[PDB]
Structure formats: C-alpha cells, structure tokens
Design a protein around this ligand. Structure first.
Ligand code: NAP
Ligand code: NAP
Ligand code: NAP
Ligand code: NAP
Ligand code: MG
Ligand code: MG
Lengths: 261, 261, 261, 261, 5
C-alpha cells in the first residue's frame, strides 16, 4: 500500500537536455515515469538520456519545438514506443532582450512561436490521448515575465503571459476531464541560458558581466539565484493525484520576486 | 463647447465604426481629440466619421489591423492630415469560441494576429512619433479573458493575456519617456459582436438565444451587460495628464466579475 | 471632468485637511460635490475648508476615525446640514514601520483599527443612506502595500490587504443595490509629511534633499513620486455615473510599481 | 514524499483536531515531523493525538488561539518536550456569514482576531526560535476568500486578505533568514462540518444531499469539493528544503475557482 | 518494480 509513484506514466519534456528541463526530467525519472526527452542538439540530449536510464525507460528525440512537421513525427514515434503521453511539460523557451523598436517581425514571431505556439500545437497533439485515458497533467514553464512586465523583454512577456492565458482557459475547459493544467513561473535560475543573458545585458549596458550577475540575484529577495531542482520540485508535486485540486495555477519559483494571488 | 481636455491631440482608434471602438471614438471626439477611425468596411466607417464631425475633426481609414502592408500605408495616409499619433487605442479584436481540439492552425493564428500581433505592429509604427513629441498614450482593449480563463475560448484568452504582457513590459520600458501604456478589460458588453457570439453559443449548445444572453449577464455581479460608453469612460480618463501615474495597469470594466489586484 | 458632474452629491472624506485627502477633497470640490471634511486638528481643517469654499459648499468636522462615539456624533451633525452622504472616501490611515519582532499588541491593533476597522464602522454608519437613495460610492484609499509586501511594514500590509478584502466582498454584496465599492492604491506620494522626512534624512546623512528623494522614488518606474492630484483624479473618475461598471477594483496609482490583474 | 523527510522537525499546527488541520497534522506525521496539535476541545484533540502516534511523536495542547496568555503558556510547555518549533501552520479560523449591516463590533473583531491577530501573535512568539535555528517554515491557511470577495463574508474576506498581506510582507522581511512564509488558500473543502451543513440544507429543502452538494461545489470548476488531504499535500510540499524558493506565495487549492497570478 | 520509488 506504500508505493504511490508515476510508474506506468509516459511523460514528454521539451527542452530537456540542459537546465530546468534536465532537472524536471531527472525528477520525473526518479518518480518512475517513462520519458521522451526533446532538444535540438544531439550531444547534450544523448548524455541526458543515458544518465536517466539508471532510473527509468528513456528515449530522446532530436527536434525543434517551433517546427510543426518535425514535432508531429517526433510525437508519433514517441507514442509508438511508450504509449499515450499522460504528462506533458512544455519547457522549451526563447528570449532575446532588446529595445522594443529593434524587435522586427522575425524576432517577434520567434518569441511567440517558441514560447506559446509550440505549447498550443503540442497540447493539441497529445490532449486526445489524455482525454482517452481519463487522466493527464499539462505543465507549462512560463516565467515571472508571464506574471509581470520587464523592460527590454516586451515579446518575451507577451508570449509568456499568453502561455498563462492558455493555461487558465484550458484548466477550466478540462476541469471535469481528469486533466490539470498549470504553469510554473521561475525567476532568474542558474542555467546556461541565464549566463548567456548575463553577457548580453552586460554588452548592451556597458557593464562588467559579474556586476550584472549581482543585479540578477538582487531581483530575488533571497539574494541568490533559483536552482533548477527547485523548479523541478514544483513540477513533480503537481503530477501526484493529491495535486488534482491544483488547477489553472501559476506557481512562482522566484524567492518572493513576484508574490502571486 | 466647454470640454477642451484633449484639444488638438491626434487619436487613432482601431475597430472604430461600431461597438466599443465607436463609443471610445465618440468620447474622445467630445473631449476635443482629432480622430483617425480604422475599420475594414467603408460604409459603417464613413457614417461614423460623419456623425463624429459634429464634435471635432475626424477622418476614416479603411484597413484590416492584421494586414501589415495595409496598416503601414494607412498610418502614412492618417498622419498627412493630423500629424503624428499622440493617442493610440488598439481596440479591434477577434473571437471564435469552440472546443480546444477544434482550433486549427489558421484559427489559432487569427486570434493571435488580430488581438496581439496587430497591437505590436501598430505600436512599433507609431511609437517613434510619440517619442519625438515627448508625450503619448497607448491603450489596449483586452478583456476579462486577458485576466482569467474561460472554457471554449483558449486562443482568445492566450491572445488577450499576451496583450496584457505587452502592456506591462512596454509600460516599464517607456515609463520615463512621457508615455503610459495601459489595458482596459471589459466583461460582456452590449455590442454586435456579443449578439453574434450569443447566437453562435446558442446554436452550438442547443439553447434559445435569449437564455444564453441571460447567462452572459449572470456572469456580471450587477446583473446586466456592460455598456460601450462605460468602457469608453475608462479610456478617456487615462488620456488626461492627471492619469500619468496610471501606467502598466489592467482596468476591469465588468461589474465585479474580475477584481484586479 | 465637467465642473457640474457631481453637483447635488454629498461627499464625506476622512483625513482631509492635508496630503492625499486634501487633494481628493479639492478634486471633488472642483467637480461640484458638497463636502464634509474630517481630521483631528482644528487649524489645518479650518484652513482646508475655507480654501475649498472657492469651488463648492464645504463643512468640516473635527474627529478621530478610530473613535466610534465621536464618529457617530460627527456623522449625525454632518448629515443634519448637508443631508445623506452619497460618496464616502475612507482616506485616513496609519503606518509605523518596524521589525516584526518589535510589533507589540497595541501597535498591531493601531494599524488594524485606523486602516481597516474605522472603514468598516464608517461604511456601516453611512450604507443605510446610500441604500435608501439607490446610489452610492464607497472608495477606500488602500496602498500598493494592500497589493504587495514591503519589509518592516507587516501590520500596514496586513491592514491594507484587509481593506482590499473588505472592498471586494462588499462590491459583490452591493453589486445590484446601485453602489460601487473600489480601492485606490497609491505608491509613495509627494506630501508635506514626506518632504519633512526627506529633509530629516538629508540633514542626518549630510546629503542634498534631491539625493534622498531619488531613494524614495526608486520603486516608481517613472523616476518620480506620485502627486496627490493623480490619486485624486482616480477618485473623481470613480464617482461618475459612467463608472458604474467599475466595481470591486483596486486601482494602482504608482507609475507601474504594481501592475494589477 | 519520503516518510523520513521532516524527521527531527518540530511542527505546531493550530486547529488540528478536525477538518483541514487534522489532515495537515496527518501528512506531517507521515513525513516524520514531531507534532504539537492545538484545539479547544479535549476529547477530539486526545483522539487525534492518539491516532497520529501510529506514525510519530505527538502531543496535544488545549487552547484557544485568540487567548494570548493561554497560547504563551501552551508554547512554553510544547517546546519543553520537542524543542523550538521549526514549522508553524496557522490553521485555526472563524467564519460567520451575515449581511454587512448586521455585523456588530464583536462579530467583526472575532473574524479579525481568530483569522489574523492570532497568526500575528503566534508567529511573533515562535519566530525567535526559527531565527536562532537558521531555518523555518511559516504556513498560513487563508482561503479563496483571502484572494477574492464573497457576498455576506465581508469580515472573513477582510481577515483572510489581511493574512495574505502579513504573508507577503513577512516573506520579504525574512527572505535572507532561512525562513519561508506562504499561504495556502482552500476553496470549499469536504469536512464533517460541511457535510452536516449539506445534510441540514437537504433536510430543510426536501432534496437529496447529492443535489445540495452540487450547489456547494458549483464554484469549483472540477465539479467536486476539495479534499482535506489535497490541502495537506500542499503544506508538506512547502516544508521541503527544495521548496526554499517558494516564498511569499498564495497557493490556491480550489480546482480553478481562483487562478492566481 | 526493480527500481525503488
Ligand atoms: N533561466 C532563467 O533565468 C529563466 C527564467 C524564467 C523562465 N525560464 C524558462 O525556463 C525554460 C527553460 O530555460 P533554461 O534557462 O533551462 O534554458 P537553457 O538552459 O538554455 O536550456 C534550454 C533547453 O531547451 C532546449 N531548447 C532550446 N530551444 C529549443 C527548441 N526550439 N526546441 C527544442 N528544444 C529547445 C535546449 O537544448 P538545445 O539548445 O540543444 O535545443 C536545452 O536543453 C524556458 O521556457 C525559459 O523561458 C528561465
Ligand atoms: N462583450 C464584448 O463585446 C467584449 C468583451 C470583452 C472584450 N471585448 C473587446 O472589445 C473590442 C471591440 O469589440 P466589440 O464588441 O466592440 O466588437 P464589434 O461590435 O464587432 O465592433 C468591432 C469593430 O472593429 C472593426 N473591426 C473588426 N475586425 C477588424 C479588423 N481586423 N481590422 C479593423 N477593424 C476591425 C469592426 O468593423 P469592420 O467589421 O468594418 O472591420 C467594428 O468597427 C475587441 O478587442 C474585443 O475583443 C469585447
Ligand atoms: N503618502 C503616501 O506615500 C501613501 C502611500 C500609500 C497610501 N497612502 C494612504 O493614503 C492615505 C492618506 O495618507 P497621507 O500620506 O496623505 O497622510 P498625511 O499626509 O499624514 O495626511 C493625513 C490626513 O488625515 C488626517 N488624519 C490622520 N489620522 C487621522 C485619524 N485617526 N482620524 C482622522 N483624521 C486623521 C490628518 O490630519 P490630523 O493629523 O489633523 O488628524 C491629515 O489631514 C492613508 O490611508 C495612507 O495609508 C499614502
Ligand atoms: N454559519 C456558522 O455559524 C458557521 C459556519 C462555519 C463555521 N463556523 C465557525 O467558524 C469556526 C471555524 O470553522 P472551521 O471551518 O475552522 O471548523 P471547526 O471544526 O470549528 O475548526 C477546525 C479545527 O480548528 C479547531 N478550532 C476552531 N476554532 C479554534 C480556536 N479558536 N482555537 C483553536 N482551535 C480552534 C477545531 O477544534 P475545536 O472546535 O475543538 O477547537 C478543529 O480542530 C467554527 O468553530 C465556528 O465557530 C460557523
Ligand atoms: Mg500582483
Ligand atoms: Mg485575481
């Protein structure tokens, strides 16, 4: 009567080879979920898949979430091996900070398509299987930029806010279908993406990278960056049957930077 | 005429031939703004322009806000008579309620492009003129669907929430440039769009249109639909110089259906 | 706003001899409301009443909002001269920042009583008259501390958040009774009290007052303090009949410091 | 969750003999925490203590959270057996719904004192011990009434919103002290008390209890009541070291009734 | 069943 885990559940995690996505995949692997991991670069993805095979059955699929044809094929292949996806984690993102007048059509569309469009399409592909099983979890990794504004991140904020809107509406539409839909909203988290953003902001503001890293930690009242495992801890909590009442929520993992209500 | 608050200010209102947009245009005309009214159909637009010439200088421009080429030409033509736009009201919207699995790519894109992409593009075209003048107002007409979820309106909620994100981020980026950026979030409002939505929902749920109308009014704690002039009243208030401290806000006009904080 | 809009409406403003309350009283006076002003010190109250008689009929009553017996007598006297109160502005507040462990019972209770308990009692006294007239406006001056946390202001944040709770619940309870209940949430505002505090810190730290003012304004994205007239402008807007659809709202007047939703 | 996670942590839960508090105590007992349970009636408290001794060391203390002298003595006795309190759960509350004009001083004060004043006092008593240990968890059980309004629950909403304000401000004040402060906001929960109310209304309206339950659950998009164990699951998740980044948050456990941001 | 959870 003691084993209450995710054994026998197929989870698909996008952007799963490094950072937050990798920590989410590790937590789901330790919980017993069968995993389909998606990322564009083979090298990091293969290492992640091999590492997590110590805890569960894992398969990796090279793919860009913004490519609909590649994603349909990827999802079809993944479900042939591990069956319908019960848990979907939309984690792959895109951010390029710049003054609003420097955001041309291409850059606006890339923010919308990677952060929001991709989640819409993947949910549409995997929702029939969840409805058939009578159980599911859809977890969207948004950001504190989905809950409040940030200057120089207008398309990122627009797309991440749109992801919260998708989350809330779908949570209500699926409320009596056995599926919950929630968003996890990290603040600045210690990842390779954040280190790339540190150098971009330093170059754009004529500041030393170390000084801008200290500014990033100062947005968090706790005076430190969020760890990827703390974001993953929120994700695995939502997958339990005792989190069924958590639906349509945005969980901020930012030390108090944004206090939801 | 005694009301001279916005005298001389060039205001451009999208979707201004009928409904909320026409009421916004009327309130701005009574306050003394010079108006550029945009809509797709010339017939209703020309009649609206002629009506509002009783209070101020008005011109109409035919265009679809989702057509980038037509909007760039439209903006060049509009600035010939009244100069750079000081007040921009992004009001044109799009909604088609349906179950999430019935939202194909084209329908998803129409919700994103009309409600969000169009506002991004028009702000990008008109922001340089506002920055040159050192003063401006950007007002985005979102919805209570930009603040909470509604079942069967997943793309509408995603786009309207994305519009709130654009509003918040741009309010911070422009905070010290003499421009405020805010969103007005109406609940169900008595317009041709709502009447068309009532008939569509009634046909799709096998209910009498009158019963669906009463259900829509029941969401408003006040027991009635919002009037277009009530949404317009919030818009004109934001254009005052005394509303400079109102920035990055979402003003719900829904009788208490959504209570912002 | 027209100088005849609120003619024939008796408005009562608490804490109205100085600061935000004085600015609220002035804006209501310019809109044509008959005013009852309440404050504890006679001299400042008499001067404010005399100043506002340039625009409308004004009367003053000396009183402490935390004294129930004094407030009942005061309210009875005010209504004998100007009739039932149609508009109530709960503006008198209390703040004393300190580390949480230094908040003794009595200091905790003073924050709750002045900012929240007093508003409950005064609304209870004046609500019957509003229900009899079939129209009313209850406007609670909360703070950005009613919408987010601040360190060393735990009782102030608790009381100001409590005032939002009272606002929201009462807005729903009175939604179909012709009365709206709303809250205005200022950020740091430029008053004589704040200027005295700026000068004291400048004198104690050997800094120019302008350097200390920059610290105080740092949370405002607009780089300046909120002006009392900007808070007052939001109050008068809510009193119009065209703001009937604005109910249960918290309007942040803080330049973008808090972005409500 | 592992049955050894919180071993060696002294947790104190107020209002722990029945309902949500009893479920919170049970989940903490299964996680290995040493428990101090507080409630006014001895019989129900003794039964709960005896039941939970199957999983961990438990002690009961008879007391009313609104009695400062009894609570100080209680806390001294409790810390003599299990040492300083590391985890505090403020769960004891009070609600008596009524039309606003029928709320006298005593009824208003009982809502403020039991739901908010008592949490302030108990946190003030136990915070020194948490600061000395360098680790702590303060979890306040608020309600969806802390995040939105409900008609006829004005004092309850005011007090529960005040508890969110206390949570937010204290989370910022203690951010760098090793202590997190969060609030859990349940919607209507299936307790024996609620089932007795369902049966009373069914008996008074000649309806099957299942028909009356549907009215109570109507606000929950999931079409059911929240289970006490779902509220408890959120509490134990917050106590983990991996939830250190969760600070100043309000976690709604209401099926999507309130969607936080 | 082989891997502990
Ligand atoms: N780090 C922060 O401070 C922060 C703050 C707020 C929110 N977030 C959100 O957290 C999520 C993950 O961010 P992160 O910081 O972990 O980023 P990261 O360290 O750069 O990792 C991103 C992962 O996603 C993959 N990826 C990137 N673009 C992809 C695409 N188009 N298709 C498929 N996979 C893709 C990357 O692998 P390949 O490059 O090989 O494809 C990698 O495995 C994002 O949604 C982000 O917006 C992060
Ligand atoms: N219940 C409600 O009515 C409600 C609730 C919440 C939010 N809103 C929002 O309020 C705004 C206005 O809605 P409404 O109810 O007033 O609509 P409406 O009665 O249908 O009027 C819409 C107006 O915009 C024009 N328009 C529509 N699509 C356009 C496009 N692509 N380009 C340019 N003009 C366009 C229409 O004229 P043409 O057809 O000639 O172009 C018309 O002048 C929208 O953003 C909507 O989402 C409405
Ligand atoms: N100033 C800010 O930056 C700021 C920011 C956020 C919110 N607020 C809120 O705005 C409101 C007004 O504050 P303020 O800054 O304008 O204050 P202020 O400059 O100190 O003025 C307070 C006014 O209220 C009166 N007053 C004070 N305590 C009173 C009491 N117990 N009973 C009756 N009258 C009383 C004062 O006159 P007497 O002393 O003669 O009684 C004076 O007329 C408060 O609710 C406050 O919490 C202010
Ligand atoms: N319409 C109504 O009249 C109505 C409806 C609902 C609730 N209520 C009131 O609201 C109160 C709280 O309701 P509830 O939903 O929390 O249910 P409850 O079962 O009364 O209380 C929950 C738990 O907290 C304990 N408790 C209650 N008040 C306490 C206090 N002041 N100090 C310490 N422990 C306390 C209870 O045990 P003990 O009772 O043994 O202390 C129980 O273990 C009720 O006690 C009742 O007075 C009234
Ligand atoms: Mg907020
Ligand atoms: Mg809300």
């Amino acid at each position: 009567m003691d084993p209450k885990s995710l054994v026998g559940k197929h989870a698909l995690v996008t952007g799963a080879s490094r950072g937050i996505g990798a920590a989410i995949a590790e937590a789901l692997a330790q919980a017993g979920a069968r995993l389909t991991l998606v990322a564009r670069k083979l090298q990091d993805l293969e290492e992640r898949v091999e590492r997590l095979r110590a805890w569960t059955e894992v398969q990796g699929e090279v793919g860009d979430v913004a490519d609909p044809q590649a994603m349909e094929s990827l999802v079809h292949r993944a479900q042939e091996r591990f069956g319908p996806v019960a848990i979907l984690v939309n984690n792959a993102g895109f951010v390029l900070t710049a003054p609003f007048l420097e955001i041309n059509e291409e850059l606006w569309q890339r923010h919308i398509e990677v952060n929001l469009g991709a989640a819409y399409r993947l949910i549409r592909l995997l929702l029939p299987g969840m409805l058939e099983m009578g159980w599911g979890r859809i977890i969207n990794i948004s950001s504190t930029a989905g809950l409040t504004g940030y200057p120089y991140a207008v398309p990122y904020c627009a797309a991440k806010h749109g992801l919260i809107g998708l989350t809330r509406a779908l949570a209500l539409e699926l409320a009596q279908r056995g599926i919950t839909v929630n968003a996890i909203c990290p603040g600045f988290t210690d990842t390779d993406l954040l280190q790339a953003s540190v150098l971009r902001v330093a170059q754009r503001t004529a500041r030393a990278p170390e000084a801008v890293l200290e500014l990033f930690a100062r947005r968090n009242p706790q005076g430190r960056l969020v760890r990827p495992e703390e974001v993953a801890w929120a994700v695995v909590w939502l997958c339990s049957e005792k989190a069924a009442a958590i639906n349509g929520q945005a969980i901020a993992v930012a030390g108090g930077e944004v206090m939801v209500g």
